[PDB]
Design a protein around this nucleic acid. Structure first.
Lengths: 213, 125, 68, 141
RNA sequence: GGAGGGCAAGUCAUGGUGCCAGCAGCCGCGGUAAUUCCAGCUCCAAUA
RNA sequence: GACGAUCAGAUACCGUC
RNA sequence: CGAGGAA
RNA sequence: GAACCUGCGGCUUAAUUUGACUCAACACGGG
RNA sequence: GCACGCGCGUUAC
RNA sequence: GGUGGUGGUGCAUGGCCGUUC
RNA sequence: CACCGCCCGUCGCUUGUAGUAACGAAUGGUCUGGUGAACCUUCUGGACUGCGACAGCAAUGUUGCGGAAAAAUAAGUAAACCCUACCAUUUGGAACAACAAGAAGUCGUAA
RNA sequence: GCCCAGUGCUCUGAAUGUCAAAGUGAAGAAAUUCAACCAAGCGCGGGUAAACGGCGGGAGUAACUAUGACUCUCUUAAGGUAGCCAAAUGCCUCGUCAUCUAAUUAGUGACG
RNA sequence: GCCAGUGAAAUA
RNA sequence: GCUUGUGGCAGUCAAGCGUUCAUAGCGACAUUGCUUUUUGAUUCUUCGAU
RNA sequence: GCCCGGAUAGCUCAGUCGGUAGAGCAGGGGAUUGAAAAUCCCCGUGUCCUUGGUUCGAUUCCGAGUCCGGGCACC
RNA sequence: CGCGGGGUGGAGCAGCCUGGUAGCUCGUCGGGCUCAUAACCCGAAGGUCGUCGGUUCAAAUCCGGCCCCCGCAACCA
């Protein structure tokens, strides 16, 4: 709870383990949070790294599609399909628009809708996990998929999600919790007023918990 | 740059052909609608022939001063004959006689089709 | 109105009166004739219930002769 | 007994009673109250007068008609009189300002069923009986 | 002076008038076939 | 008299005072 | 005209 | 309610023949 | 006869 | 002075028919 | 002519009417306080005149007596006139108003 | 007589908005500057005119004619009620008709 | 789900 | 107090009225004037008494 | 006495920045009714008050009189 | 200007705090009903939700910024 105990989630919580000495292999810590919890559309992000610094952790197939040319916008990589003859029948509704825009990351496709997005395609998907975000959709979905694959930084969109990092095993305290904060930027604060907008969260590394608030 | 149906002249030769007997030679027959063909092929009157000549004199005698002598008739049942074009015939309707300048287009059509028989309705109350 | 005074009489065709063929006896004579034409025994003779009207002779020339 | 008293000594009573209960009669109450003298003729049977103007009056209830009438000025009395001119052409003889002789119509009071407020008849024009002027062979001026 | 009734006397298929002119004591007549108006005819009543 | 309601209208037939 | 208001 | 049909009103018209008007007028005058 | 207002009906969604 | 008249009065009328049924 | 029947009032309209009371005037009558013509009577008055005596025989004159005209007088009958009250009989008056009668006026509907 | 909307007065009233000083919180190193709540009062609600005072205006609108008890209206609390006048209030006004005069810019009686 | 999505505004 | 427009008042010419005639009695138009109880301008005299 | 105002058919009454004259009711001819009211079409009727001016013409725009019609009259 | 409440048919009122449907009365317009005449009733025409934008699938509806309306508050040199 943004208090002294931050370094109790960090410093005092960095060698908890669950057995004997402390092992003999590398470490793996971070600092959990989110993306903005807005609705993955209107306003929740912009630009600027923390860091932070990471990438996947497990899988990365997100979202990118629109026309017959959006497939190759997911061929030399791996993404979801919006289909062509579906935006007039079933390419969006609940578990539909989901499918294409409901993965884990967010979305990195382009744009093309017309008079249909106030309760179907572009619509039903927003806070679900996608609704047309900033993925430099013009050359494709790879270069700006540096904001959708690796490096990172920590593009935090769709539904929660983000990253963190600072050191290895044991050598951080005030800058461990203050490294977790450092592992937060346009995700912990931003422009006009943004020093906080949530309730709680989690964190650790592999040991056991962090802040007991 | 405007022309006319089937050649106003071909018909004067078609109508007044070798056998310019019955006002409507069997030639003109091929041209008219079934209803008209019916009538002529059935039993057309002779009066319709003396009326014919009455227009004739009106068309020539009149100087190029384009002032035709109106020919008066009740034969509203007459179907304009080719040679009947150009003359202004006064046709009775119910009240008086109607003067109509015969154009090439009103042939094969009933002479009555122009003598308005009733004044349609204007309104107010 | 006013000018509409006597509209009737003015519009009436003045017929003349039948210039007395002879005379009308005035005196005991008239009362006599009447006595004879009505209360004379030949009329009091036939039923008093079936005797005629002293003016059914409205001057009808057709019934005037039938009686006399 | 009945209301009336039957005493040989009570004649007076019965007498006064009759003199009293008798006022209930209009015919009585009428002549008794010198009423006849106050009318336009002052009791009189007839009256002379000057024609003030020939006016016409409308019939009443089931009848609709223009009655001929003369407004007269009685001589010694000096009153406005409503006088009905009799038979057909009659009013054609009455010249305005002439002298006229008037009499009532059936008992001085109600006018003939037809007339409205007229109570008089016209019998003479310039002192010439109307009937006389009504029949050609009689008189005219 | 009348002839629908009271109130004696026209059942004229009469002419004019058309709620107008007018009649009518009181009922009521009259708005195109008036038994009550105007008039003819014939009738009735009292009759110098 | 003051009010509610009813009515096309109600200082009226009901209702609160 | 997509089964039709007060009637 | 719909489009036609047919009758009545209305308004037009040279003229739109006229009867009929709550069941006891209006596809009725055999219209 | 047509700006329209009625009344039997014919055809239909 | 007639004929004839889908000209007027159904409140002058026959005949007929509708309604009350 | 039978509820699409009867029918009531406000206001309006149409055609009309001058009542009762008061007041005005007219005629007549009475009361109150005065002015008061005329005449009966009265007390006067006494031209004029009759008689007797004296101045003359006479006209005339003096006086006594008697009748007696005008004038004047008081009380009285009381005409007219005025003033003060009151009665009777007639007759008069107006805009607005009022009354009378009528209706398929107007608004509603009392019965 | 009718008007409580206006101005005043005045009641427990209003579920809520201002609203000062101290008192409280937050921030700086303080000085200090931001906060939240906060009595009355205000504003909201009601009564109140023998309280100050108020009391409309135009259109149509038959049974010669002019006419309004008629309705239509636009309208502010309410739209002058009994009563009363050219009056010591009436503009035009010397109002119009009488009445009192030979005569009345006076009187009085009427009429709105 | 979504590329389809209507409606006053689409969700795991 | 000037000034006199505006008021008022007279005056010339004579087309006209005046039924016959311009002037008995009046006079359009046009034009000359007097008047200082209208009114209007003006601000000289008097608010350091009218 | 000066200041505005109306003058229009049989009676009450409006007028492009002139050039034309109207409803209403009386009214007679109808439609209508059973007949009639009511109503709807129609008729009619005149220097738009008398003069002078302005104009091509004036009922109208001007100027005076004119009749009746509201506001001003020792000290 | 600072606080707070509000503009929705031609008029007066609803719908907004509870996003998807814009209603009532009068007025305008047509028809029922009736033996008929009033009365009475039905059905139509008509709103861009002051205006601009944002969330949103969707906005009169929630959110803003302007434009007027009313109420509070107020110290200008």
């Amino acid at each position: 709870i943004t208090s002294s105990q931050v370094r109790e989630h960090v410093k005092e919580l960095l060698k908890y383990s669950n057995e004997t000495k402390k092992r003999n292999f590398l470490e793996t810590v971070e600092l959990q949070v989110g993306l903005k919890n807005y609705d993955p559309q209107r306003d929740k992000r912009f630009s600027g790294s923390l860091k932070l610094p990471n990438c996947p952790r497990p899988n990365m197939s997100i979202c990118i599609f629109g026309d017959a040319f959006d497939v190759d916008r997911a061929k030399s990589c791996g993404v979801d399909a919006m289909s062509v003859d579906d935006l007039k029948k079933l390419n969006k509704n609940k578990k539909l628009i989901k499918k294409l825009s409901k993965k884990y990351n967010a979305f990195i496709a382009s744009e093309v809708l017309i008079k249909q997005v106030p309760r179907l395609l572009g619509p039903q998907l927003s806070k679900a996990g996608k609704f047309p975000t900033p993925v430099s959709h013009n050359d494709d979905l790879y270069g700006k998929v540096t904001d959708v694959r690796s490096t990172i930084k920590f593009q935090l969109k769709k539904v929660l999600c983000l990253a963190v990092a600072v050191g290895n095993v044991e050598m951080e305290e005030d800058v461990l919790v203050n490294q977790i904060l450092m592992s937060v930027n346009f995700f912990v604060s931003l422009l006009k007023k943004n020093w906080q907008n949530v309730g709680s969260l989690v964190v650790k590394s592999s040991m056991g918990p962090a802040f007991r608030l | 740059f405007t022309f006319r149906g089937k050649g106003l002249e071909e018909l004067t030769a078609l109508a007044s052909g070798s056998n310019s007997e019955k006002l409507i030679s069997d030639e003109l027959a091929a041209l008219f609608d079934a209803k008209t063909r019916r009538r002529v092929k059935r039993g057309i009157s002779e009066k319709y022939a003396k009326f014919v000549n009455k227009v004739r004199r009106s068309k020539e005698k009149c100087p190029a001063g384009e002032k035709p002598v109106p020919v008066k008739t009740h034969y509203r049942s007459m179907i304009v004959i080719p040679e009947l074009v150009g003359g202004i015939v006064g046709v009775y309707n119910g009240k008086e006689f109607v003067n109509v300048e015969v154009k090439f287009d009103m042939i094969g059509k009933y002479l009555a089709e122009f003598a308005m028989t009733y004044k349609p309705t204007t309104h107010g109350k | 109105t006013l000018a509409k005074a006597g509209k009737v009489r003015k519009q009436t065709p003045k017929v003349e009166k039948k210039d007395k063929p002879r005379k009308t006896p005035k005196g005991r004579s008239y009362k006599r004739i009447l006595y004879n034409r009505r209360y004379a025994p030949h009329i009091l003779a036939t039923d008093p219930k079936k005797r005629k009207s002293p003016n059914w002779h409205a001057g009808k020339k057709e019934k005037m002769d039938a009686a006399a | 007994g009945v209301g009336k008293p039957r005493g040989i000594r009570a004649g007076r009573k019965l007498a006064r009673h009759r003199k009293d209960q008798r006022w209930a009669d209009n015919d009585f109450n009428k002549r008794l109250l010198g009423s006849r003298w106050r009318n336009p003729f002052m009791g009189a049977s007839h009256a002379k007068g000057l024609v003030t103007e020939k006016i016409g009056i409308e019939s009443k209830q089931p009848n609709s008609a223009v009655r001929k009438c003369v407004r007269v000025l009685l001589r010694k009395n000096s009153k406005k009189i409503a006088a009905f001119v009799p038979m057909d052409g009659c009013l054609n003889f009455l010249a305005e300002n002439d002298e006229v002789l008037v009499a009532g119509l059936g008992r001085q009071g109600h006018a003939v069923g037809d007339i409205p407020g007229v109570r008089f008849k016209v019998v003479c024009v310039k002192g010439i009986s109307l009937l006389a002027l009504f029949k050609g062979k009689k008189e005219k001026r």
